[PDB]
Write a protein that binds this ligand. Structure first.
Ligand SMILES: [Mn+2]
Length: 243
């Protein structure tokens, strides 16, 4: 069975339909949030749905516009073992928000430490070195998963050294640079994701079950059968939960 360990169920036009479809497939999803204020509404998608695992987040792209939602993060942290989407984004269009992004992410890591550590699904686009500096400074924040890692191989080697895990998606398994990044990752720290509906495949928003294509992609890169890839990813989720 399949795992999509970073997906925005709450950003689909009909989130309940997507959640139901995941349950029908017994497809485990990490349902991430973009502001902690979204917790109650997005958590509700998981009621009666044991394959929907909801994460408490604050996405770097919305830290300015949703600044006042920050106190809901600490409020709800006791209700989940999963934090995401959180992190930093180095895109020029967000650069004026950099101080606020850093403040929020540092706050989040510190609160995670204070509550005994969490499993983190982390955004690092164009800010990989800065994300790693933050994680190195806050090692007791928990287990960091770098979602859709797109930085350098130099930075990837450092992330591995810092104990990062990786969730990899459709674009990564289908590109030269992505396949090269995957080859440097320890297989026991690789998870699969879609990042739907943000990720588009063939001009259409990805759905969680498009993660079958990531498993197929990894089968080719690792040169093992898709079933063994599925087993390894499940084993990896079990081990992750053990951390
Ligand atoms: Mn995302």
């Amino acid at each position: 069975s399949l795992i999509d360990f970073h997906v925005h169920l709450d950003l689909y036009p009909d989130p309940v339909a997507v959640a139901r479809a995941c349950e029908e497939r017994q497809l485990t999803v990490l349902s991430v949030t973009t502001t902690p204020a979204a917790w109650r509404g997005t958590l509700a998608l998981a009621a009666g749905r044991p394959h929907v695992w909801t994460a408490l987040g604050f996405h770097p792209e919305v830290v300015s516009e949703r600044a006042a939602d920050l106190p809901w993060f600490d409020r709800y942290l006791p209700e989940t073992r999963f934090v995401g989407e959180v992190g930093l984004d180095g895109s020029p269009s967000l650069r004026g928000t950099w101080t606020q992004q850093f403040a929020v992410f540092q706050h989040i890591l510190r609160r995670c430490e204070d509550h005994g550590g969490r499993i983190l699904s982390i955004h690092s686009r164009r800010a990989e070195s800065e994300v790693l500096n933050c994680l190195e400074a806050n090692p007791r924040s928990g287990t960091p998963i770098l979602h859709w890692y797109s930085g350098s191989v130099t930075e990837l080697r450092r992330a591995i050294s810092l104990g990062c895990w990786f969730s990899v998606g459709p674009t990564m398994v289908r590109t030269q640079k992505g396949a090269a990044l995957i080859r440097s990752m320890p297989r026991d720290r690789v998870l699969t994701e879609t990042d739907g509906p943000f990720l588009e495949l063939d001009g259409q928003a990805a759905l969680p079950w498009d993660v079958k294509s990531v498993v197929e992609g990894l089968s080719k890169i690792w040169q093992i059968p898709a079933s063994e890839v599925e087993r390894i990813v499940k084993e990896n989720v079990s081990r992750l939960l053990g951390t």
